[PDB]
Design goal:
2 copies of one chain form a homodimer.
Chain A lengths: L2 H23 L3 E5 L6 H4 L3 E5 L3 H8 L9 E5 L2 E7 L15 H12 L3 E5 L6 E5 L2 E3 L4 H13 L1
Parallel strand pairs in A: 1-3
Antiparallel strand pairs in A: 1-5, 2-4, 3-4, 5-6, 6-7
The structure holds ligand TJ9 (2 copies) and chloride ion (6 copies).
The site of one chloride ion has 5 residues of chain A, from loops.
Catalytic activity (chain B): 2 ATP = 3',3'-c-di-AMP + 2 diphosphate
Subunit structure (chain B): Probably a homodimer. Interacts with CdaR. May interact with GlmM.
Protein name (chain B): Cyclic di-AMP synthase CdaA
Chain lengths: 154, 152
């Protein structure tokens, strides 16, 4: 385990801990992780943080009725770049009618970037992921961690 | 100058966040490093190294959240860490009207030249600890003058 590999693993654990905490509490969340496609244009629409990753900061951002909780958090490598960001809303006809704006935004950014977006439903606490225009819903924590590990490789 | 404009933006962010928390009576503890290094206390909290904004400061201190207990420590115009430990003053002149937040603020002000702002969770009153003294029930004008004196 090189320092970079360990850093990546700590970031993955930080994400999965935060998502699990919010899922249990029905705390709605929208977390977009930059991959190879730069997302500066969307990062600039939010509140700049440029912060180190922690599960604690991720949770604190999404607490309901707070300044930062609406909109997307966008992450870069080992960084929380900005919160309350705008994302394009998908027009896909495959987006279930019972889903929220968070899901429409996550699929939207996944259609025009190679990013990975995680969504926590404030209705059910269910966890979903948007990638390449596809939305995969009702993920177990095992499924989420394995997705992140597969996606962080490259 | 760019530095000066950055400083005033930081002061405005702090004062807007403190005003918000005072109105809601949200307890808060914010220490700003000056010439005495505070790395030993920064290391006790959660690393952030985050840009200052009123929004982030508010989100940190929301009650019953991971980051709300402990001190935020600011250094070099950034939020270095949250949920940090500070030394509790042993002064016999701190009123028992005041909380652990205030005793920690006075304590760090006894061993550093930092400026610490405290919002009371009971009254929303704003105080500042500097050089071992605690200045209570501050107006918005007095807090801004203190921060301007401190950043100059
Ligand atoms: C064109 C447009 O409207 N883009 C949006 N993006 C995001 C991330 C939004 C949002 C609103 S409330 C919430 N939790 N997330 S709206
Ligand atoms: C020895 C010791 O414990 N020092 C402390 N520092 C800080 C900043 C504290 C705090 C603020 S709010 C809360 N519940 N605790 S206790
Ligand atoms: Cl970019
Ligand atoms: Cl939702
Ligand atoms: Cl779901
Ligand atoms: Cl409170
Ligand atoms: Cl908590
Ligand atoms: Cl208090």
């Amino acid at each position: 385990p090189t320092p970079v590999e360990e850093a990546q693993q700590k970031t993955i654990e930080a994400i999965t801990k935060a998502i699990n905490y919010m899922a249990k509490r029905r705390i709605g969340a929208l977390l977009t992780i930059e991959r190879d496609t730069g997302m500066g244009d969307y990062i600039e629409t939010g509140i700049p943080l440029n912060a180190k990753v922690s599960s604690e900061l991720l949770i604190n951002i999404f607490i309901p009725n707070t300044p930062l909780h609406d909109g997307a958090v966008i992450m870069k490598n080992n960084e929380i770049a900005a919160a309350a960001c705008y994302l394009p809303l998908s027009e896909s006809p495959f987006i279930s009618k019972e889903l929220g704006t968070r899901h429409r935004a996550a699929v939207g950014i996944s259609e025009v970037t190679d990013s990975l977006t995680i969504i926590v439903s404030e209705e059910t606490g269910g966890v979903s992921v948007a990638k390449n225009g596809d939305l995969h819903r009702e993920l177990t924590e095992e499924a989420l961690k394995e997705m992140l590990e597969a996606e962080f490789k490259k």
